[PDB]
Amino acid sequence: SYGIVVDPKEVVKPISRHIYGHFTEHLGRCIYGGIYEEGSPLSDERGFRKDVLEAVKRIKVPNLRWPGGNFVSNYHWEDGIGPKDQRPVRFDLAWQQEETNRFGTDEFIEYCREIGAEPYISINMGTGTLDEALHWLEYCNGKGNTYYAQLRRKYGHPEPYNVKFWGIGNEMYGEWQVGHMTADEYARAAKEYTKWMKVFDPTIKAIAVGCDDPIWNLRVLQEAGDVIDFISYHFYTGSDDYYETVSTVYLLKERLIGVKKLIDMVDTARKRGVKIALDEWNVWYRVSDNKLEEPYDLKDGIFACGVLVLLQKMSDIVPLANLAQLVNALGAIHTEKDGLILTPVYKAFELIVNHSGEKLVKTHVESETYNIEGVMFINKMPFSVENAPFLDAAASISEDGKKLFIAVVNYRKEDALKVPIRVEGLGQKKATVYTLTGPDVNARNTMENPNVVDITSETITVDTEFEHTFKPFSCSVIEVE
Amino acid sequence: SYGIVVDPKEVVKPISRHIYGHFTEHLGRCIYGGIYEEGSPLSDERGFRKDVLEAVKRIKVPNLRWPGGNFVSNYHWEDGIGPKDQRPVRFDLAWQQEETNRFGTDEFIEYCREIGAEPYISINMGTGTLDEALHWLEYCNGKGNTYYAQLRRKYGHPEPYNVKFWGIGNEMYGEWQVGHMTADEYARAAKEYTKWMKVFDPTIKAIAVGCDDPIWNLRVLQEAGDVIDFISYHFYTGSDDYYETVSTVYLLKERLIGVKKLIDMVDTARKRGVKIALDEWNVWYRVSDNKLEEPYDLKDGIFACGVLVLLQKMSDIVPLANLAQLVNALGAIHTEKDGLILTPVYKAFELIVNHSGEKLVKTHVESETYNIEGVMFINKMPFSVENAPFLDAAASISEDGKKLFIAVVNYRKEDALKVPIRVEGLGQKKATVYTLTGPDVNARNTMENPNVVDITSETITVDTEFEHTFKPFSCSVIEVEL
Amino acid sequence: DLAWQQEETNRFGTDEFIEYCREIGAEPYISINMGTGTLDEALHWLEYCNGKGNTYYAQLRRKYGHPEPYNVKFWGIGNEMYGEWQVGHMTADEYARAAKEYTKWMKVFDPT
Ligand SMILES: OC[C@@H]1O[C@@H](O)[C@H](O)[C@H]1O
Ligand SMILES: OC[C@@H]1O[C@@H](O)[C@H](O)[C@H]1O
Ligand SMILES: OC[C@@H]1O[C@@H](O)[C@H](O)[C@H]1O
Ligand SMILES: OC[C@@H]1O[C@@H](O)[C@H](O)[C@H]1O
Ligand SMILES: OC[C@@H]1O[C@@H](O)[C@H](O)[C@H]1O
Ligand SMILES: OC[C@@H]1O[C@@H](O)[C@H](O)[C@H]1O
Ligand SMILES: OC[C@@H]1O[C@@H](O)[C@H](O)[C@H]1O
Ligand SMILES: OC[C@@H]1O[C@@H](O)[C@H](O)[C@H]1O
Ligand SMILES: OC[C@@H]1O[C@@H](O)[C@H](O)[C@H]1O
Ligand SMILES: OC[C@@H]1O[C@@H](O)[C@H](O)[C@H]1O
Ligand SMILES: OC[C@@H]1O[C@@H](O)[C@H](O)[C@H]1O
């Protein structure tokens, strides 16, 4: 009833490196007090929190999304460039804060270079214009003599930033968004912005706004599916119950398959190979204010491990994903003036991203399954999932072919699971198992106790067949050879 | 590389018995000269062709759809009831033929009763009205003193017919349909007709029209997803090329998953458990006239075996399917005045429905796969399929738990496959393999040679592990006592 | 009659009109009713006039005295359907769709 079979010689498909993306919005203390804090003793002279930097570098961010989120739909990017003391203070409608614009495009790009991430910029389609977006693109990517390319040089960067990922609006369907649009308006607008941005720089990838309204999605695909590269999906989940939280990995799975099928049903989109960008996702159900400082526990970190494992298996369909968000706001990392906490959501990335290959290999998993009905998100919406596995895994190998990584999530709350594992043609060797778990499903890290939830390692002896006991509510990578 | 592991003690889900249903339209010689031929030396006292009747009983039809198809969207069911001599001759717009109406509701129900099939009636939403559909339903199902219930009694049938399946229109999106509608029109009308019909008889199942247009499907699910029970899907396929034909089993599979996910995306539909009725499907690509006598070959019968195995594994999403059509028109069975021909499409049904269980059990298949880019249907539309298997299987067990059926399709065009099969906890014993096969991919049965493509039986010995050599382009059922 | 507010006895009808046409040597040109009429009703008029087979309305023309088809060549698909004075008047989109529908099925029955 439980077992795992891996064939390292059978490569199924690449795993897109962008599944491990992140997102920082100008919301609460995400940016100001989070990644950035002028005159914190913990910041360098650019204002970057150095302790945050060290934690972000450790999870090897492939791409970073900015600046929103709801914020970008009332953000004018030119307010954020040039001599800092000359930048206007603006009232942000989305989260109802004064915004000083001291963190703006050039500082965001500097932050990306620092951490090694590809910038992923979202444009303003609420109060912004086509010209305004093309100017932002020209500023970042232009290598000619246009005014905004010159302006980037004048402000201290001769070389183009080459921003590759551009988000065509944020959540333009929602009544909460400034300048929100109907399906027809947004679909025509997404086609218009995308096609002209691509006339200026044909190398960019454009992410168009998707949601759960299947008519919305289809209008977007029908109208813009000849020029866009992704349609985005946002997924937020969770409740006080353990199984109700972690099972929604498998709800997310069905949601994604649905969006994929929509793409399949629009010839031009199916033919260009439009894909999905899961560009916002996390647990989010406890907090509902303008700071969103959700206190993640181990339960939430197991959900996060389950998503990363899922994306390794589905990255051909969903090559771009971005946890919402990096710091403080729905934060993987929580900061205080005098330190930081690494939540179990952070730990999920610290585990998977440091123990994972570039190619997915044939993995066949035997598992008991369960059915569940629960609630999710801040409004406690009911959902159900059928046949969610208690045990799930994905095996990957490194580019060179020297290392095998078997990630295993044991969702069982109540019991450890002894699992026979088979690996075809594997010698008999030593391997390290890295395990994320904690003392109970509501365990948390604090300033006082920063490692209640942490990754432990043990050496084990491995063969073509072997068994391993996986603790309850845990995720482990068996790193071999 | 190729292998099959079955666990007969792990029951995955039931297999809906309605996946093997059939469809007879008033099209060309499907009815007149097909199932029904008044005065033929081959017909009984009701005018039913007896040779056809024997062939239809052999495939254990679980439900039979009638009378269309494009036909029904200009059919007035009252034209086909009462003393046959007084039924009016009509010009059928769909297929441009005079319809004498000598085969109508009472004859159809009698036909269904004779073959043991549940009737499935489509209603006319092209030229018909709400009243007219209500009256048809009252005639068939009314147990009271209403005019139409009394009329059914008067014409010789006191007991109500209890027709369970009702088709809410046919292909109402297509410009070829008489009275075709926009999506918003049809979605509102489907809601209106279904809801009042269920006020008269809450026990019926309503099938609403779906297609390949996702906006159409979603209007229908959004507007009527609170009252309909199924959304229908039609699937026609085929080309001259062997792989282009059989691989579209797997195009269908993705089309179905598509429509299922549309249902998932409409909360009222999803919560009501709205399913798919694949209520027309076949190979159709050679003939384009008003008679549609598509000359099915073995390649086409292999596509059909592939669909039935697929439906065994997906019947929880697609519990109702109907091959189009039973006789002559896209015909599984082809008739002439002096006999009939069983096509390999008919043989697919002969094989699977006689050798299959009621519950699907755990079946893991190893198979090499292939990708293809082809054309399909009379207009040769391009399609592509990714990772179609060369080998597929579904294992099922009988209701009592005492017979195992392992259906296996070898799609390879040229080579036999010796496949290792494991059945968990099986003793060593004898079993029978029933195999639908023929000499080449284009083989056909004829009047002169009715058995070129047919089902063979042989004893083999099985055990917990055994092997069997499966002919190329063949389907087999290994039937085992447990 | 709603259009001219008169009692219409119908003592002059299709058969008398055709007979009048044959008397004067004119091709009949018949306008159909798209106000209170239906597609079936138009098709039945056409079948009565032009059918040469065994359809109910062809037989009906024979029963009333005229075994040979009338072969009416000109059919008016509606009259002034845009006008508010017309019974059952239509918008452009409604009339356009209906004209296509009536015309195409009438021509399936008689393509001449
Ligand atoms: O991540 C918080 C908010 O979630 C989504 O509703 C918005 O795009 C973002 O501003
Ligand atoms: O803000 C998170 C939201 O919950 C869903 O309704 C919104 O569309 C999704 O983006
Ligand atoms: O109820 C709204 C919830 O917000 C979204 O992320 C969840 O998917 C949606 O179901
Ligand atoms: O094969 C299972 C799912 O159905 C397909 O359409 C999706 O691409 C895939 O992830
Ligand atoms: O498993 C833990 C990760 O692997 C190491 O390289 C990272 O620094 C460490 O945190
Ligand atoms: O501690 C875990 C770190 O990640 C591993 O890859 C490093 O070698 C190991 O020391
Ligand atoms: O739910 C599907 C049903 O399961 C079987 O028991 C019935 O015969 C079949 O029609
Ligand atoms: O079965 C042939 C025709 O195919 C479909 O187009 C129609 O519903 C049916 O009349
Ligand atoms: O008649 C078969 C047809 O080809 C497809 O476009 C139609 O919708 C389908 O019903
Ligand atoms: O021309 C298209 C073919 O008719 C339909 O049945 C096929 O599915 C459709 O793709
Ligand atoms: O047939 C099983 C299909 O696989 C999944 O991708 C769909 O949700 C489910 O209907």
Ligand SMILES: OC[C@@H]1O[C@@H](O)[C@H](O)[C@H]1O
């Ligand atoms: O395998 C063929 C079928 O099994 C027997 O009952 C059927 O009559 C026979 O034709």
Ligand SMILES: OC[C@@H]1O[C@@H](O)[C@H](O)[C@H]1O
């Ligand atoms: O002939 C094959 C028929 O199918 C079986 O069930 C019958 O016994 C067998 O004779």
